[PDB]
Amino acid sequence: GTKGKVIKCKAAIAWEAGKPLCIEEVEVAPPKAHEVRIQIIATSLCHTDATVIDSKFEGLAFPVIVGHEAAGIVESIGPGVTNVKPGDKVIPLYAPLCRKCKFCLSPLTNLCGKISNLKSPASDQQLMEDKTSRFTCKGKPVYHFFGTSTFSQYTVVSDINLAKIDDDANLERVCLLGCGFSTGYGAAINNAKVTPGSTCAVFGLGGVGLSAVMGCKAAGASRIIGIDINSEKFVKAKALGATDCLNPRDLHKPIQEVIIELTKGGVDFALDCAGGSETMKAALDCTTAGWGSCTFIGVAAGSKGLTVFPEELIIGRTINGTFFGGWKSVDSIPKLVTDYKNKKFNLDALVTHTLPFDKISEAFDLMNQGKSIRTILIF
Amino acid sequence: GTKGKVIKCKAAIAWEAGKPLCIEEVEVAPPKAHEVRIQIIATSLCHTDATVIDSKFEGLAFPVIVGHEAAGIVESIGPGVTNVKPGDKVIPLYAPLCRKCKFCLSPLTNLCGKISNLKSPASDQQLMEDKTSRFTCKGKPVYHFFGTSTFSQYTVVSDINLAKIDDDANLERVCLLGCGFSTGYGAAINNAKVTPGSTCAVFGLGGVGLSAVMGCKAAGASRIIGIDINSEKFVKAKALGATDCLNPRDLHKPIQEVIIELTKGGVDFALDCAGGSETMKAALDCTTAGWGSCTFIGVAAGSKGLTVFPEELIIGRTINGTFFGGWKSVDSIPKLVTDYKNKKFNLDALVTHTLPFDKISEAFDLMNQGKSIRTILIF
Numbered sequence: 001g002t003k004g005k006v007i008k009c010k011a012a013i014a015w016e017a018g019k020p021l022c023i024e025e026v027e028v029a030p031p032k033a034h035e036v037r038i039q040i041i042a043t044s045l046c047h048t049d050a051t052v053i054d055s056k057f058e059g060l061a062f063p064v065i066v067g068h069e070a071a072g073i074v075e076s077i078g079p080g081v082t083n084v085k086p087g088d089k090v091i092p093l094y095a096p097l098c099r100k101c102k103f104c105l106s107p108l109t110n111l112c113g114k115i116s117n118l119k120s121p122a123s124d125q126q127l128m129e130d131k132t133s134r135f136t137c138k139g140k141p142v143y144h145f146f147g148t149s150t151f152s153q154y155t156v157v158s159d160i161n162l163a164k165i166d167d168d169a170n171l172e173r174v175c176l177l178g179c180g181f182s183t184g185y186g187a188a189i190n191n192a193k194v195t196p197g198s199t200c201a202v203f204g205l206g207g208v209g210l211s212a213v214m215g216c217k218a219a220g221a222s223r224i225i226g227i228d229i230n231s232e233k234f235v236k237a238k239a240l241g242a243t244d245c246l247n248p249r250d251l252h253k254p255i256q257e258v259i260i261e262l263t264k265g266g267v268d269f270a271l272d273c274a275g276g277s278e279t280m281k282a283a284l285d286c287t288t289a290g291w292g293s294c295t296f297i298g299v300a301a302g303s304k305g306l307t308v309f310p311e312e313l314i315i316g317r318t319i320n321g322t323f324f325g326g327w328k329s330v331d332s333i334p335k336l337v338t339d340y341k342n343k344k345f346n347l348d349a350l351v352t353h354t355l356p357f358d359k360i361s362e363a364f365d366l367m368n369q370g371k372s373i374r375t376i377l378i379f
Numbered sequence: 380g381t382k383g384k385v386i387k388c389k390a391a392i393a394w395e396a397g398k399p400l401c402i403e404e405v406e407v408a409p410p411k412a413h414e415v416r417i418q419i420i421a422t423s424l425c426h427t428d429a430t431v432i433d434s435k436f437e438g439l440a441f442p443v444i445v446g447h448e449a450a451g452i453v454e455s456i457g458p459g460v461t462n463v464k465p466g467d468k469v470i471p472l473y474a475p476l477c478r479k480c481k482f483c484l485s486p487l488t489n490l491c492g493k494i495s496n497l498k499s500p501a502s503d504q505q506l507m508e509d510k511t512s513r514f515t516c517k518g519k520p521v522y523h524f525f526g527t528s529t530f531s532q533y534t535v536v537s538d539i540n541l542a543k544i545d546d547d548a549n550l551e552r553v554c555l556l557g558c559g560f561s562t563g564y565g566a567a568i569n570n571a572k573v574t575p576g577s578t579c580a581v582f583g584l585g586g587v588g589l590s591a592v593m594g595c596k597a598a599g600a601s602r603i604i605g606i607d608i609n610s611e612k613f614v615k616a617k618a619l620g621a622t623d624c625l626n627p628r629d630l631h632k633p634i635q636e637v638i639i640e641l642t643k644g645g646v647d648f649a650l651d652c653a654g655g656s657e658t659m660k661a662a663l664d665c666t667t668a669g670w671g672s673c674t675f676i677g678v679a680a681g682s683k684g685l686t687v688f689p690e691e692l693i694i695g696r697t698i699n700g701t702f703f704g705g706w707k708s709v710d711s712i713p714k715l716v717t718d719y720k721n722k723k724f725n726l727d728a729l730v731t732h733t734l735p736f737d738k739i740s741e742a743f744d745l746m747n748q749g750k751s752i753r754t755i756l757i758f
């Protein structure tokens with residue numbers, strides 16, 4: 001039995017910013033009060049994992065185990081835990097649900113007051129609630145990431161940072177609900193609030209963006225324009241519901257102007273699922289006057305964001321954003337697992353590669369080289 | 380009998396940017412097809428009139444007759460006019476309602492496709508439909524402003540740029556519905572969509588801001604924080620519904636942080652009724668995470684706008700704006716005139732000064748020195 005014992009296992013550690021991850025042996029401490037130790041079965045790479053370890057990102061403590069998109073099995077539970085037991089299938093959640101704070105009590109948001117670093121949510125939850133870490137490597141502490149740290153074979157999370165899911169769930173596919181799918185799909189349905197018959201633009205056709213295409217389609221959009229600088233993403237996008245696909249590099253005319261001409265005035269809903277100043281600007285610019293909606297999802301390390309003028313809003317734009325697709329994490333994720341079982345949406349289309357966890361650096365290369373959508377890493 | 384005849388009258392002309400207005404004798408041509416010539420009875424000064432003739436403002440054609448906040452009486456109508464007749468009391472409208480375009484047909488906006496300059500609406504409608512002007516001075520054409528040009532004793536507007544109002548209306552007060560009151564009041568009700576029990580921050584306590592205070596109160600706000608760099612505005616704001624008033628200059632701590640501490644996390648709805656980079660930043664920053672709403676109203680000549688990071692929206696903010704308070708102009712303004720007759724809101728509180736039109740420069744001085752809210756100018 002490993003219950004109550006330190007577990008020695010493999011993890012991918014970022015020792016410092018701007019360097020590749022290193023496979024190391026780590027010690028994972030037993031869970032304390034209101035914590036759960038999880039054996040990670042499958043985990044995938046989100047662009048956020050790469051962003052936060054970039055030298056241009058500020059506020060992350062090193063050394064760190066990143067990873068936030070996974071599915072696993074409960075190995076053990078700490079004192080006071082009643083929501084899961086050993087053997088349960090679970091999805092670790094970076095978006096907590098304490099159920100008691102003013103944000104958790106509101107139907108208007110899926111934010112939780114546990115996240116106090118509002119200027120940079122991705123740099124919060126590097127320590128457990130008692131302000132210590134459950135990871136050790138080479139006699140020193142290793143920080144958590146986003147309350148999840150799924151690039152370790154065993155991780156420890158708070159009991160409000162996981163969802164118990166169906167016992168028959170495919171752990172090699174539902175891990176995608178841990179961030180990318182849920183974010184894109186939910187951004188369209190919950191944050192953007194895409195309406196039947198509307199026109200949509202989705203910038204960036206990766207894991208999040210393809211999921212936003214699926215979300216727009218489920219919401220009843222009549223036209224869905226996919227935008228990517230990689231035209232190889234277009235066949236998948238059209239298969240998942242994109243009616244049009246455009247590469248900004250194909251014309252000297254700025255993409256927002258191409259979109260405005262094509263739609264005769266702009267789209268109803270734009271979603272930026274790529275990130276950075278240029279995509280933010282194009283996403284806002286391509287929306288119709290009167291009632292145009294622009295939803296920000298993507299982020300870029302060292303970006304200076306977007307300069308906005310009041311006239312751009314005065315003509316009738318709304319700007320908003322998403323955190324984990326607007327889903328109340330602990331309640332919604334098990335329902336999304338059931339939806340997937342019932343074939344409500346196509347998760348398998350997101351998976352382009354499957355590797356052993358040892359080849360985690362290849363997953364980074366595939367992503368940075370634009371060759372993958374989601375790579376599933378198997379421990 | 381002036382019908383069909385050129386009218387000679389007084390107007391205040393801006394000959395070039397950055398100079399005071401000059402009272403001149405101008406010739407006003409008769410109205411052509413689908414136009415109405417109006418005798419202006421009372422007109423007031425909105426900050427926008429000063430902004431557009433500032434040297435830092437780009438895209439206004441000179442010489443020009445500004446003014447867009449007025450009430451008057453119809454002197455004559457051109458061919459095909461079915462909506463007003465000589466003698467009718469009217470409010471000229473810079474926000475047209477053509478009723479044909481995609482915007483007019485939508486309940487989601489009060490924009491009209493007649494305004495084609497969406498990057499700067501204030502610089503459109505300097506000419507009539509046929510691309511000519513009805514004003515002449517010293518043998519040369521003088522441009523219109525915002526389709527209204529109310530700083531001339533007689534002006535000519537299209538038949539979709541005015542509202543017929545109650546015969547019993549007080550023209551020296553309902554002129555305020557021509558921009559400032561309607562914008563602030565409507566921004567709270569229509570654009571921000573202030574909800575019962577909510578907390579609000581209104582930045583800038585002039586004509587627009589005090590009207591936003593009145594709007595927030597009417598919408599059921601339980602707390603209304605007024606912000607101004609001029610503390611003399613606070614007695615009026617509190618009288619009209621402000622529960623708290625703050626001057627940013629009183630503490631070294633940034634005003635947005637003072638507001639966050641005071642409300643324990645920020646307000647539900649912020650409205651920027653001042654304008655510029657500083658107020659836009661403070662308005663966005665002071666809003667709660669989760670569901671904070673920031674509405675931009677104010678503009679500043681030569682402003683560099685606001686740099687926004689996607690994280691500021693990801694944590695659950697919405698940003699929007701107002702154009703003339705979200706009112707379908709021609710339909711809503713007569714109803715607002717009736718509301719005023721029925722004492723629904725306090726327009727008189729907005730009037731601090733009344734002057735003959737000859738002293739128009741004093742009205743600018745009062746505004747620029749911060750000594751007025753609205754000055755009524757009487758022809």
Ligand SMILES: NC(=O)c1ccc[n+]([C@@H]2O[C@H](COP(=O)([O-])OP(=O)(O)OC[C@H]3O[C@@H](n4cnc5c(N)ncnc54)[C@H](O)[C@@H]3O)[C@@H](O)[C@H]2O)c1
Pocket residue numbers: 045046047048049051179180183203204205206207208209227228229230233248273274275278279296297298299300322323324325367370373693
């Ligand atoms: N806000 C949230 O809660 C949340 C959640 C998940 C991911 N994210 C962020 O969402 C973004 C997307 O994540 P992902 O894992 O799908 O990334 P990804 O790398 O899988 O896909 C990004 C796509 O953007 C495209 N792209 C890059 N530059 C572009 C440009 N200038 N114009 C058009 N397309 C461009 C790339 O070619 C790629 O196909 C990332 O910035 C990530 O950090 C945010």
Ligand SMILES: NC(=O)c1ccc[n+]([C@@H]2O[C@H](COP(=O)([O-])OP(=O)(O)OC[C@H]3O[C@@H](n4cnc5c(N)ncnc54)[C@H](O)[C@@H]3O)[C@@H](O)[C@H]2O)c1
Pocket residue numbers: 314424425426427430558559562582583584585586587588606607608609612627652653654657658675676677678679701702703704746749752
């Ligand atoms: N968007 C629209 O449809 C619309 C309509 C009407 C007016 N406007 C704009 O709204 C703004 C308000 O117009 P107004 O006529 O009421 O102006 P105003 O000059 O009468 O009032 C502005 C108030 O803002 C205050 N102020 C200035 N800087 C401030 C700061 N940093 N913090 C807090 N308060 C500050 C001033 O002291 C003043 O009391 C102007 O920018 C005007 O052009 C927009």
Ligand SMILES: [Zn+2]
Pocket residue numbers: 046047048049068069179180
């Ligand atoms: Zn992610």
Ligand SMILES: [Zn+2]
Pocket residue numbers: 096097098099100101102103104111112113114
């Ligand atoms: Zn909570």
Ligand SMILES: [Zn+2]
Pocket residue numbers: 425426427428447448558559
């Ligand atoms: Zn105005």
Ligand SMILES: [Zn+2]
Pocket residue numbers: 475476477478479480481482483490491492493
């Ligand atoms: Zn119209």
